[PDB]
């Protein structure tokens, strides 16, 4: 594990620490949850998605190499990964006990019914929950977790990328750092084909992204529901 690689991990950890509040105190600022009137959860969860986008931006800005990229690339990458990083980062609150995201209290505890009350069908939700279960099972070190989130964001593969070779070279430094960290600082059996399983999660996310996009197009089809979102959410997903 090189010194440049040690440094890269320390940065991502702190970057994550600074963008992910495990007490979820800001949640009081959101429009309230309503669990009774379909789409009752749309205003609370939109606010949460919106907040989460900002925190992913703040995280992304600190990825070593991310600043060297052009503004338009920066745009393209955040736009297309946002929902994925939110799915990934939400794994920290996801609990297998009852297949729910537990953000510190019952008010901020989300389940299938809740995500449903925000206009989403099982075509998304069921594989989203399966995704969370298989990610939780990997039992990642926080270091692998923050590297995965960074690799997801810096993908040369995203449509509309100008400098695909630069994005790739940056992704590579992170891949290598993650490949090397698994070998070093994950003990077996936890480290068995662990990189391959991580990269696979990355493919599941694309699939989840596609589904979210289509269910987003359909939801934001009625201007009545589209007006329940936030400006950042309209700009990023819009």
């Amino acid at each position: 594990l090189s010194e440049e690689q040690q440094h890269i991990i320390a940065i991502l950890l702190d970057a994550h620490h600074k963008t992910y509040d495990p007490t979820y105190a800001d949640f009081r600022d959101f429009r309230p949850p309503v669990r009774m009137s379909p789409l009752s959860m749309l205003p609370h969860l939109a606010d949460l998605v919106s907040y989460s986008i900002q925190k992913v931006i703040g995280f992304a800005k600190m990825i070593p190499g991310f600043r060297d990229l052009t503004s338009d690339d920066q745009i393209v990458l955040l736009k297309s990964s946002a929902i994925e990083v939110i799915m990934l980062r939400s794994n920290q609150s996801f609990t297998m006990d009852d297949m729910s995201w537990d953000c510190g209290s019952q008010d901020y505890k989300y389940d299938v019914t809740d995500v449903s009350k925000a206009g989403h069908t099982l075509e998304l939700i069921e594989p989203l929950i399966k995704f969370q279960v298989g990610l939780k099972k990997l039992n990642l070190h926080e270091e692998e977790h923050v590297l995965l989130m960074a690799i997801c964001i810096v993908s040369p593969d995203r449509p509309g990328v100008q400098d695909a070779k630069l994005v790739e070279a940056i992704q590579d430094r992170l891949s290598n750092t993650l490949q090397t960290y698994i070998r070093c600082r994950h003990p077996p059996p936890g480290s068995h084909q662990l990189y391959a399983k991580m990269i696979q999660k990355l493919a599941d996310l694309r699939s989840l992204n596609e589904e979210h996009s289509k269910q987003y197009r359909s939801l934001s089809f009625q201007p009545e529901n589209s007006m329940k979102l936030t400006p950042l959410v309209l700009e990023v997903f819009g």
Binding site: Q54, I57, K61, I75, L78, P231, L232, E235
Partner: peptide
């Protein structure tokens, strides 16, 4: 076309 995303990145 994304002024809010830009301001957050700057």
């Amino acid at each position: 076309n994304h002024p809010m995303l830009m301001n957050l990145l700057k």
